Design a protein around this nucleic acid. Structure first.
Ligand SMILES: Nc1nc2c(ncn2[C@@H]2O[C@H](COP(=O)(O)OP(=O)(O)OP(=O)(O)O)[C@@H](O)[C@H]2O)c(=O)[nH]1
Lengths: 227, 46, 855, 97
RNA sequence: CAGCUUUACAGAUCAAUGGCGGAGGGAGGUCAACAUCAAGAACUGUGGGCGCCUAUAGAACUUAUAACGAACAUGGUUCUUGCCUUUUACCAGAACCAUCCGGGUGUUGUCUCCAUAGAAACAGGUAAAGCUGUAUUUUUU
């Protein structure tokens, strides 16, 4: 990273624009974060369904913890119909991940939980996506991120457990979280583009010689537009 | 990309007549190709 | 002519003092102090110089925000990419500053920033040569290290006035967190050490020689300066000197306006501690720790200095620095101290004699300058030259003499005691130092050091330039010696260029390197294997970078690093046998003390010999040594005193010289031998020239034979080794030392009031090869090693040369006796003396080596 | 007055609080700030290593960054029988100089 | 304990000259819109105020280098490994562009708190603030 830095310049952000000009974005409802997260999850669930509908309506159906699976009628034609894109899958995975973190928060907020457990849960989520859900099945540059997270976790655990304490109980989710955020940032724009494409579903070496031949011919034609 | 021929095209436009265009000689396969096609094919008529 | 000058002036920082005034001053000598700031590695001499520069100038260009604040140091005299990036000052880039004194007698100061890192003593040597006062700097913490002592010793040779700057008070205040009393004690100890290192003079804060400082935090002062600023309100003008005197030493102050009795009552904290160190401590503590308002109030009251509105909102370290600056004003105290130190011109004459033999000067009739260093200040090659007498105007055509052509010239002059000027030089432009610009000037003047642009073509490394107008003037003239570039090269490297289509380019670059870095014996060998003797690793690396990046820009192969070994014997010779195509000679190993003396009028010589090695009168009479290697050449048979054949020696010893230069074992020079002539069977028919020629080979052969007889050896050099470890990592260091072949720990010196075991040592230069890096890694970034060669200490390569069995492995290191030979063989191979991948050593002549020494 | 405001963009403290904060941190971010610790562990050093295809036992390794082409082919320079292998000449060195 | 400068002042003639300006706010906002981005900055050009400050706009050269951001993810093509044989999707290293994720700086406007004159000095008084001060050989006994 150090070796290859990156430069930006002039820009106008999206969120601010949305807040300002675009209806129907009314704004700044001071939500307890958990509620907001839940809402987002719900919306995510809705969106996938909508997308599916827009395509040929499938046999498969999502869980509210997003784990996509087929209802019934497992056939070749069906499979063909319902392969769709890896981008979509990635998005779904992301949503699931979000739910998992949000769900831990929710759990913490209600009973049958602890705060320590919350942190630990978060850590588990982040530092095991590889366990908890496959994005690594859909975009393998997630795998690098996952590896990094794992490494971080490893570093922490020796750092943490110099004393007699040894087991599942450990919070400190920060660097893993950061990594995940970075990954998301890396991935968002492409995902957004994909989504746009999906919605706008009605509206939009050695060939060189051939090209030359064509182009020249065209030029010639232009030159002589006679009888 | 296609710049080196533009001048040539322009020149062509300037020069030619309609009559000249009309009387462009329909071109003969100077590398007697169809004969060769005939001959190989006949040799290797399967 | 004028427009160009104006343009040049424009492309530069505008100074707080007037440049014109400075120039004017430079016309008049006694108003130009040439100072070389010189110290150990990372004393902070460059930093200090930067401070001075800052003080001088209105605004400096590259002086960014951070540097201004005081986080990063700004080294205004780093200049070059190498140096900026490296962290080391690496050449001699000084500057010229008009500075006022305590009592503002303006005086222009040619400051020169020498590098601290030992492998650049070359530069230090140059600085010394240039400078008539030498600002030694010291790290408080690391203390008076061996390096400092060495510098002092070598400065008392030069010779020069030694102003000391004890830099890094900040580190004892803040890092070591010494109690003020403890700090004072430490300082005292340091001073004592310095004094010990010195022979003649005594050094102390009183009498303006010490200058206490911390360049990180950016403040220097002398006691006197302090008194001037902040003890003139409280006392009358009559009892101020007395007060100052009282200030230093085992002296106390119990309540009494204005007495002050030596010793003592109830409470401790001496005068020094009381009126200086304690105050400093207070300042530090309030600057960091106190609420700001109170501090401000204090500063309004006690020091009469005002914190601005912005300055209150600085972060502690920067803030602290600012406070310090406010307190101790733009550093005139240092200047004052320097002035006090420099006699002046009692020493100056002596110094000049040392450089260029004793005699007498000639002002108006002829100008003479010491071309000291060639450098690359503004890209192009300049020459830093000290005009010693006369005045050198722009466009003047000037005589030149490289200090190779110096001794010879002197000899010629002596002999003399048609005109013949051997080379010349048109002086295209001249200017001042420096930092990041040459201030161009028409007139060079007797006293001032200046960069001249025409001077280069003829000379390399060091030189004497002059402009005589007569034969008498010429006769009067003396020539500077070559600079005793204290450390002396050892460390070898062999270059090839990767694509020898560009050998020429490499050669060109190599010349530049030789010029620009003057501690670089670059031998071009017979077999296309261009060689570079650096001081050491780091220096070599720097040079390589300069060459491979800037002065050449080619992919350039580089051998694993070697060293020059040299030829000497253990036992005496046993059979002087002549040679014919007729002299025989034989050599004895010299006494160690004598050798050491050599490393550092016939009757007089004899006396000296007697004093040294207990040599008899006959022995004294016989001798006639050469080269500064060292070897000694004795005319000790029976018949020679009656004979006039052995008379006329000047011719005879040419052969000996050659022999000394290029030995038998390796064509690698001879060392540490007392040669003795035993027979010179000259025939009846002379033909004198022919005879001389014969002798010239024959003598060499004889010498070789003698060496062979004497159980000869290759001598390795040894690096003397500083290591400044944290105490409990000394075992690690010891282990490391053990791990390699040659090495030794002479003395673990505990540094006063630190955790730093200054553990001096010896290491063979060969087995060094990045030793520093190894030391640092092992000792987890603790104990900066330093390797060096000031001593010119050689030693036996363990075991017996001339043994064909020797060793087992090719690729691996060889055992110690075995090694005795292996190096020799490899050296021979490198030279192009042996023939084959398997070979041996033996010396003709003759008679089958006397029938294999009679079986 | 210890910040710009509720925007929370610039912050500016006094000492004791800062000290306390530092103390609190100590367990977590005890990075040993003796600059020399990082000799052969600076970013620059790492970069150098990368461009030299060279390691440090602790440090990272890479794909070699230039075409790994030997074929020096044993000249009078860089022979076995000319140069002398007293020192092992580790990679540690190659990046440090 | 003396000096002049400034503030509060009392009533003066009131010129007079200077200052003060013929008065336009100061904060801050996870409020926007608009530019312009390493800090330079020399040097030249042109403004506005006195060999020189303050704005700009044109390159030189800088060191960037560690930190516009003590932050680090992702694309696209070309070269090169390697999966290999392929669609992604990639392993891991280059090159050059781009993509987000953040940021300042001023230009403005708007929303929440802190403000608050419409002009004073001359002549020296009162009160405070800011700096300057004991003759016997070289200055004034
Ligand atoms: N603690 C402390 N550090 C200092 C002091 N002076 C300088 N340094 C730091 O130590 C280093 C030495 O400063 P330099 O001026 O580069 O040392 P130098 O005199 O140039 O040494 P050479 O490179 O050999 O010439 C810098 O990184 C400084 O920040 C000091 O008084 N106290």
């Amino acid at each position: 990273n150090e070796l290859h830095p990156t430069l930006p310049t002039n820009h106008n952000k999206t969120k601010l624009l949305k807040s300002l000009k675009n209806t129907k974005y009314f704004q700044q409802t001071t939500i307890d974060w958990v509620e907001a997260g839940l809402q987002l999850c719900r919306q995510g669930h809705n969106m996938l369904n909508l997308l599916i509908h827009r395509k040929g309506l499938t046999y498969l159906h999502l869980d509210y913890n997003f784990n996509l699976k087929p209802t019934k009628t497992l056939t070749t034609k069906e499979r063909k119909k319902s392969r769709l894109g890896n981008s979509f899958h990635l998005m779904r995975e992301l949503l699931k991940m979000m739910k998992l973190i949000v769900d831990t928060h929710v759990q913490f907020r209600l009973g049958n939980v602890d705060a320590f457990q919350l942190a630990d849960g978060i850590h588990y989520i982040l530092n095991h996506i590889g366990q908890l859900t496959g994005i690594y099945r859909y975009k393998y540059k997630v795998m690098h991120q996952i590896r990094a997270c794992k490494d971080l976790k490893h570093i922490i655990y020796y750092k943490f457990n110099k004393n007699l304490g040894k087991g599942p109980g450990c919070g400190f989710w920060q660097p893993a979280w950061r990594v995940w955020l970075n990954f998301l940032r890396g991935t968002i724009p492409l995902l957004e583009r994909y989504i746009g494409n999906l919605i706008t579903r009605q509206f939009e070496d050695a060939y060189y010689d051939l090209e030359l031949r064509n182009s020249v011919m065209d030029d010639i034609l232009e030159m002589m537009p006679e009888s | 990309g296609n710049v080196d021929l533009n001048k040539l095209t322009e020149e062509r436009e300037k020069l030619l007549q309609s009559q000249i265009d009309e009387n462009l000689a329909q071109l003969t396969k100077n590398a007697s190709n169809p004969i060769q096609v005939n001959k190989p094919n006949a040799a290797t008529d399967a | 002519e004028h427009t160009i000058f104006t343009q040049l002036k424009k492309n530069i920082p505008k100074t707080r003092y007037n440049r014109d005034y400075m120039l004017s001053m430079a016309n008049i000598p006694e108003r130009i102090i040439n100072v070389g700031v010189i110290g150990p590695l990372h004393s902070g001499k460059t930093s200090l110089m930067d401070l001075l520069v800052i003080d001088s100038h209105k605004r400096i260009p590259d002086m960014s925000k951070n540097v201004e604040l005081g986080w990063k140091p700004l080294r205004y005299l780093d200049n070059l990419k190498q140096e900026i990036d490296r962290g080391l000052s690496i050449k001699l880039n000084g500057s010229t500053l008009l500075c006022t004194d305590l009592e503002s007698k303006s005086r222009m100061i040619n400051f020169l920033d020498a590098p601290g890192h030992v492998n650049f003593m070359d530069e230090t040597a140059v600085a010394l040569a240039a400078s008539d006062l030498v600002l030694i700097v010291i790290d408080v913490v690391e203390g008076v290290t061996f390096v400092v002592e060495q510098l002092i010793k070598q400065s008392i040779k030069n010779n020069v006035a030694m102003c000391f700057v004890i830099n890094k008070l900040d580190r004892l205040i803040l890092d070591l967190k010494l109690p003020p009393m403890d700090a004072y004690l430490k300082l005292n100890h340091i001073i004592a050490n310095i004094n010990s290192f010195t022979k003649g003079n005594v050094f102390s804060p009183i009498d303006n020689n010490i200058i206490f400082a911390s360049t990180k935090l950016g403040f220097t002062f002398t006691i006197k300066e302090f008194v001037s600023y902040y003890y003139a309100h409280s006392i009358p003008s009559s009892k101020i000197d007395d007060f100052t005197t009282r200030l230093w030493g085992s002296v106390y102050y119990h309540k009494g306006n204005f007495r002050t009795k030596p010793f003592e009552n109830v409470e401790k904290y001496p005068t020094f501690v009381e009126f200086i160190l304690i105050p400093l401590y207070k300042i530090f503590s309030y600057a960091l720790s106190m609420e700001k308002d109170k501090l401000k109030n204090l500063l309004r009251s006690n020091f009469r200095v005002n914190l601005s509105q912005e300055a209150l909102q600085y972060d502690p370290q920067p803030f602290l620095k600012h406070v310090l600056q406010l307190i101790f004003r733009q550093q005139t105290g240092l200047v004052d101290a320097i002035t006090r130190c420099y006699q002046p011109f009692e020493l100056f004459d002596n110094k000049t004699a040392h450089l260029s033999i004793p005699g007498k000067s000639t002002p108006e009739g002829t100008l003479w300058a010491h071309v000291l260093k060639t450098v690359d200040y503004g890209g192009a090659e300049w020459s830093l030259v000290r005009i010693y007498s006369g005045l050198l105007k722009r466009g003047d055509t000037v005589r030149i003499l490289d200090t190779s052509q110096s001794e010879s010239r002197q000899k010629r002059q002596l002999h003399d005691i048609s005109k013949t000027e051997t080379p010349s030089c048109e002086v295209e432009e001249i200017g001042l130092l420096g930092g990041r610009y040459v201030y161009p000037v028409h007139e060079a003047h007797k006293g001032q050091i200046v960069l001249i642009k025409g001077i280069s073509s003829a000379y390399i490394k060091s030189a004497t330039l002059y402009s005589v107008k007569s034969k008498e003037d010429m006769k009067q003239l003396k020539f500077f010696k070559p600079l005793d570039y204290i450390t002396e090269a050892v460390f070898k490297i062999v270059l090839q260029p990767l694509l020898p289509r560009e050998l020429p380019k490499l050669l060109d670059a190599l010349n530049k390197i030789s010029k620009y870095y003057p501690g670089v014996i670059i031998k071009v060998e017979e077999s296309g294997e261009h060689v570079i003797l650096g001081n050491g690793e780091l220096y070599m690396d720097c040079l390589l970078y300069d060459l491979r990046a800037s002065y050449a820009k080619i992919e350039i192969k580089i051998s694993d690093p070697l060293t020059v070994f040299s030829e000497s014997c253990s036992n005496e010779s046993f059979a002087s046998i002549p040679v014919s195509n007729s002299i025989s000679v034989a050599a004895e190993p010299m006494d160690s003390k004598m050798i050491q003396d050599l490393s550092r009028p016939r009757k007089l010589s004899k006396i000296l010999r007697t004093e040294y090695g207990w040599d008899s009168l006959a022995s004294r009479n016989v001798w006639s040594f050469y080269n500064g290697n060292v070897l000694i050449n004795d005319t000790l048979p029976d018949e020679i005193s009656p004979e006039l054949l052995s008379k006329y020696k000047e011719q005879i010893i040419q052969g000996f010289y050659w022999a000394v230069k290029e030995g038998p074992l390796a064509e690698e020079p001879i060392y540490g031998v007392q040669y003795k002539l035993l027979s010179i069977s000259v025939p009846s028919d002379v033909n004198i020239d022919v005879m001389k020629s014969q002798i010239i080979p024959l003598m060499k052969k004889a010498c070789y034979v003698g060496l062979l007889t004497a159980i000869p050896i290759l001598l390795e050099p040894i690096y003397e080794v500083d290591i400044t470890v944290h105490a409990p990592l000394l075992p690690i260091v010891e282990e490391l030392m053990k791990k390699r072949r040659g090495s030794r720990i002479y003395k673990t010196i505990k540094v006063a009031g630190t955790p730093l075991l200054e553990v001096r040592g010896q290491v063979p230069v060969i087995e060094s090869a990045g030793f520093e890096t190894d030391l640092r890694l092992s000792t987890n970034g603790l104990g900066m090693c330093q390797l060096y060669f000031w001593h010119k200490i050689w030693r036996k390569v363990p075991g017996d040369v001339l043994d064909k069995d020797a060793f087992i492995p090719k690729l691996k290191p060889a055992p110690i006796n075995s090694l005795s030979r292996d190096f020799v063989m490899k050296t021979r191979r490198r030279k192009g003396i042996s023939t084959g991948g398997f070979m041996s050593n033996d010396g003709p002549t003759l008679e089958k080596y006397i029938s294999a020494e009679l079986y | 007055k210890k910040v710009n405001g509720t925007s929370y963009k610039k912050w500016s403290f006094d000492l004791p609080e800062m000290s306390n904060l530092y103390r609190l941190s100590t367990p977590l971010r005890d990075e040993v700030t003796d600059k020399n610790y990082y000799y052969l562990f600076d970013k620059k050093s790492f970069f150098n290593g990368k461009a030299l295809n060279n390691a440090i036992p602790g440090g990272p390794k890479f794909e070699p960054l230039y075409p790994r082409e030997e074929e020096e082919d044993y000249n009078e320079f860089n022979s076995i029988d000319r140069v002398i292998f007293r020192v092992p000449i580790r990679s540690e060195y190659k990046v440090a100089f």
